[PDB]
Design a protein around this nucleic acid. Structure first.
Lengths: 133, 63, 190
RNA sequence: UGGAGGUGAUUUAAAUGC
RNA sequence: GGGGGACCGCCAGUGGCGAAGGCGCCCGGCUGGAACGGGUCCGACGGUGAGCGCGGAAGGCCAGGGGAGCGAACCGGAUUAGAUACCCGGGUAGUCCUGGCUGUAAAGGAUGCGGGCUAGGUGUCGGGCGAGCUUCGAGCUCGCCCGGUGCCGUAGGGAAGCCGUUAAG
């Protein structure tokens, strides 16, 4: 350790938000070092509970003990999701993660709309009558 | 307008008296083009939409 | 992997060439010299008015690392989806205004400006507000130093100067610098 | 008070009868 | 960090342009049409139009080049009583470019074109005009007028729905 002047570390937390799964992933402010990666289908046994909020608090609590272990006390949250493939809108882990950070005791800085949104068109699947129900 | 009760254009005549040479010119209230003074080479009016916008102060008698 | 943690080095961000050594930014990493080009996002707490308020998210890049100390330049700016959606309105316009810059220092700089129009009458004066940006900007880059010229643009100074001229032509509202990207570094002589 | 778009869409309700 | 091909959300409008199919990043060159003010010039030169000629989405076809995503056919899974499916994972032709062919549609406004005549109202786009405002730019508004683009509705028409100065009078 080369002398630290601030005595506070910051770890930006990418939050990747699917209706099939939730992924929480906090790194250092650069992004060049991965402390910890924890999703919503190690917590559980089944596919239905893979997303939900309750996996998306517990996943975001196991990680939160290892960031406390480094010195990272402040966190910026970068909420995002698959935009080009699917719909951009975040799933059930977005209201969930921020609740999972206020209980873990990690401070909450910036909360951010950085989700992939094309400036353009690309043809997804589903046509004639779009995707059919 | 008045296409079936006799259409008359909007027009009129006005005597313009040049400020650079005192030259008296007859001018259609709607200049379509640049009217040039015949003893200055100046521009009295410039053609824009509707009535030709008169460039700066030039004297006017309205007929 | 299996760091004690003791294969974890720590560096510290000192980011000048827009301000002095902004101490903000602390770097953990594993091994020595895997960050030498890695990019850090900051709000900037140098000016706590505008640079914290409406200028959320700038990218800075550690060009070098010395004795375990990161030296960081301006690499870029980008605004959040927050900004761009909020401002725009209907029955009016949103405009976007590029210019590929050359300053006298030998840096090239790609800007995109974004102004929002005053309501009705969309016309050729729109692109002429476009034209009056690329004209004024070229001339400020040629005159001003580059380090200065990246302080001004990021500050509202540019958005302000643009507006005075462009409100004569066809009055605007909500003009900004949407994004900036460092076109070419090297120098005037490589 | 009555009209036009843009997209979520809902599978937990089963074939036929002179 | 690099490479590739497609495309240009918001903007974007009850908006504009186009004969029609149709058309949407920004900048410049070339170019078609269109509006308006002034009819300044020609002096009936007009209308329509069988035959005839020309333009015409997507798909298909031909030859060459290209190929990310997507995806008929096709290969698996599920579903299901069975599934040649809806749902999911791969996938070729094609989708892109260039030259050519082909010529079809609920190619709709299911409404051929041109002229004249026949209450109105309102919103909107562009052009003109008289004002007030002004950041001194038609930028923000009021009204008359001209051209277009919607909605509502008198007389009339209609079988009725509806149409009704953008007619289906």
């Amino acid at each position: 350790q080369v002398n630290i002047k601030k005595k506070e570390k910051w770890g930006i937390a990418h939050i990747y938000s699917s209706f099939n799964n939730t992924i929480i992933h906090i790194t250092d402010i650069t992004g060049a070092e991965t402390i910890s990666r924890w999703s919503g289908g190690m917590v559980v046994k089944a596919d239905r509970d893979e997303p939900s909020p309750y996996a998306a608090m517990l996943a975001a609590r196991r990680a939160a003990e290892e960031a406390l272990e480094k010195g990272i006390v402040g966190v910026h949250i970068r909420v995002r999701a698959p935009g080009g493939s699917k719909s951009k809108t975040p799933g059930p882990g977005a209201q969930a993660a921020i609740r999972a950070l206020a209980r873990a005791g990690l401070k909450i800085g910036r909360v951010e709309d950085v989700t992939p949104i094309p400036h353009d068109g690309t043809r997804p699947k589903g046509g004639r009558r779009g995707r059919r129900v | 307008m008045a296409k079936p009760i006799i259409p008359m254009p909007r027009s009129r005549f006005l005597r313009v008296k040049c400020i650079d040479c005192g030259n008296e010119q007859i001018v259609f209230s709607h200049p379509a083009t640049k009217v040039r003074c015949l003893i200055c080479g100046a521009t009295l009016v410039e053609p824009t939409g509707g009535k030709g916008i008169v460039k700066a102060k030039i004297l006017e008698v309205l007929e | 992997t299996r760091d004690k943690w003791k294969l974890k080095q720590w560096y510290i961000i000192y980011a000048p060439d827009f301000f002095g050594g902004v101490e903000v930014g602390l770097t953990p990493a594993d091994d020595p010299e895997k960050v030498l080009n890695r990019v850090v996002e900051v709000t900037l707490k140098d000016v706590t008015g505008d640079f914290t308020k409406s200028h959320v998210k700038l990218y800075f890049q550690v060009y070098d690392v010395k004795g375990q100390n990161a030296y960081t330049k301006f690499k870029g700016m980008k605004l959040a989806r927050s900004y761009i959606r909020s401002l725009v309105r209907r029955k009016t316009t949103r405009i976007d205004g590029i210019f590929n810059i050359t300053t006298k220092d030998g840096y090239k700089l790609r800007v995109m400006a974004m102004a929002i129009a005053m309501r009705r009458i969309q016309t050729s004066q729109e692109r002429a507000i476009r034209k009056i940006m690329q004209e004024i900007i070229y001339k400020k880059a040629e005159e001003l130093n580059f380090k200065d010229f990246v302080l001004e643009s990021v500050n509202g100074k540019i958005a302000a100067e643009i507006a005075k001229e462009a409100k004569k032509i066809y009055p605007l509202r909500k003009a900004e610098i949407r994004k900036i990207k460092v076109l070419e570094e090297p120098q005037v002589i490589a």
